[PDB]
């Protein structure tokens, strides 16, 4: 559908759609108006990424210049965590009840099969 | 915002969409209803502020090759802003989308090499 809402790896993008079925039939991007049941759908644009491990961690935004990299520190901030896996169909959804308004960051980590890791951030807010 | 944008290579123009008569929410490439809509543009790269920028929003013909002929683009056109420099880096346009359907925003930048680059943002109404 749309091509505007995204997280980026260079030229390769992952399109994101957000909806909140308990509140509305509308679709959102980085300004999510309500607390509650939230579904985030990911559509990987580059077919080659379907064979690449992809991890998602959504954290409360600590508003620090540098994001924590330690797993214990990241865990303290974590709203939701999906371990790395290959998405062969190129698409997936996550559902979460956001009980609290605030700023959040979705951290998408790709593992190149050079074994190198790249992380991209999509920043959004709830409420 | 940080997620909603049209791309020129690695460069971005961030886009926010509102419908003030309907809701206090902000949208991106899915506009929920027909009617009064405001699209706000924020040009991230300072060098792009000195570049002529043209905007044409068309109904999406859903074909692999987009018409380039002026009559054909005009037949599909919802709104057209002639090329202009946005020195402040931001601007908004207001339009009443009367019809549900798929749309394409054609953004044309004129490099100071004088060559033109177009990017497309795709969205839908309803
Ligand atoms: Cu982008």
Residue numbers in the entry:
A (entry chain B): 37 to 163
B (entry chain A): 38 to 163
Question: What do the authors report?
Answer:
Here we show that PmoD forms a copper center exhibiting the features of a CuA site using a previously unobserved ligand set at the interface of a PmoD homodimer.
We heterologously expressed and purified the periplasmic domain of PmoD encoded by the Methylocystis species (sp.) strain Rockwell extended pmo operon (PmoDMet49242_1452; there are 10 other pmoD genes in the genome of this species). The copper ion is coordinated in tetrahedral geometry by Met42 and Met44 from each monomer, and the two invariant cysteine residues, Cys41 and Cys65, form an intramolecular disulfide bond. Given that the crystals were obtained from the monomeric PmoDMet49242_1452 species, it is likely that the observed copper-binding site is a crystallization artifact. Second, the loop between β7 and β8 provides the other four CuA ligands, but PmoDMet49242_1452 lacks not only this sequence motif, but also any histidine, cysteine, or methionine residues in this area. Thus, despite the overall similarity in fold to other CuA domains, the PmoD CuA site is formed by two protein molecules and a completely different part of the protein structure in contrast to all previously characterized CuA centers which are housed within a single cupredoxin domain.
